[PDB]
Ligand binder design. Sequence first.
Ligand SMILES: Nc1nc2c(ncn2[C@@H]2O[C@H](COP(=O)(O)OP(=O)(O)NP(=O)(O)O)[C@@H](O)[C@H]2O)c(=O)[nH]1
Ligand SMILES: [Mg+2]
Lengths: 123, 194
Amino acid sequence: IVISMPQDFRPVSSIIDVDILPETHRRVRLCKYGTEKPLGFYIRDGSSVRVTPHGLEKVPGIFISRLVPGGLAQSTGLLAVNDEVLEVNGIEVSGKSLDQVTDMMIANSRNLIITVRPANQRN
Amino acid sequence: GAMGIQTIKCVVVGDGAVGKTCLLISYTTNKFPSEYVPTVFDNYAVTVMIGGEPYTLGLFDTAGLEDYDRLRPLSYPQTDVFLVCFSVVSPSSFENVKEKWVPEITHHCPKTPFLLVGTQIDLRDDPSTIEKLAKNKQKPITPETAEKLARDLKAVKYVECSALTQKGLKNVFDEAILAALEPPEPKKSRRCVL
Ligand SMILES: Nc1nc2c(ncn2[C@@H]2O[C@H](COP(=O)(O)OP(=O)(O)NP(=O)(O)O)[C@@H](O)[C@H]2O)c(=O)[nH]1
Ligand SMILES: [Mg+2]
């Protein structure tokens, strides 16, 4: 059985800024193979309960709703359903609508920096 | 290229600074990273021709530093083969193979095959290196004892290399690729289910 040297080297994903971020957050980098394929995950609307300058309120939140099987996001293992999306390439999603956050991801899809608050799986 | 007839997921673990990242970068790009930057999580892909056909090799680099223990299991799901690393001139790294690394991957992925990989073998004959070890009555690890550990810990086999000189470098991955393909049973049964 003949095995060649490696070819077409490509960095796909990583976790960055781990030391300067809250432990409950994860900043992920995704670099898709080519312009034409999808990042591989959908996002939905939702509400997040937070302690605001005025108290505990339920504010609009963005969450991952599913992963395409065999897709990019899924292959990395860095994104799961129920993870809340907080930021996309330096732009926070708080004052943003679902469609805007969707547009932002498509705009930055060739080099995506997405910061999420992972969901915890029951042990 | 754009396609592969099979995807082999290879995850690399081992003490901080044993040479995991250089091993990977040296193999895939023929470049030897300059200075040491601890890894948190890095994923790359290359295409390797096996039998004249394209195969996708998904390479997953992990954090040797225990500060990041919490994040490590993220690399484990769907792994086909594991490379457990230790520097042949680092007795402590070798010890951690039996005390942390093999227990950890075997705990998470009980049926996934793993290779024991000795790294930085070009340092076996390095003065500074040999002096410091001896300065505390230590010697490098020999292929003999290394192979014995592989055996005891149930590793597919032991292989050693140097990312710097690339000696034995390609063979570590070829063997990895083989460990992921050879077993007489379905590959799905060997793939980590997490
Ligand atoms: N002489 C020699 N030195 C090496 C070799 N491989 C790695 N090193 C040395 O080890 C340092 C750390 O290498 P690195 O690949 O980043 O290893 P690590 O296992 O990934 N560290 P971490 O777990 O923190 O990410 C390098 O700066 C280099 O000096 C080798 O094959 N020969
Ligand atoms: Mg590293």
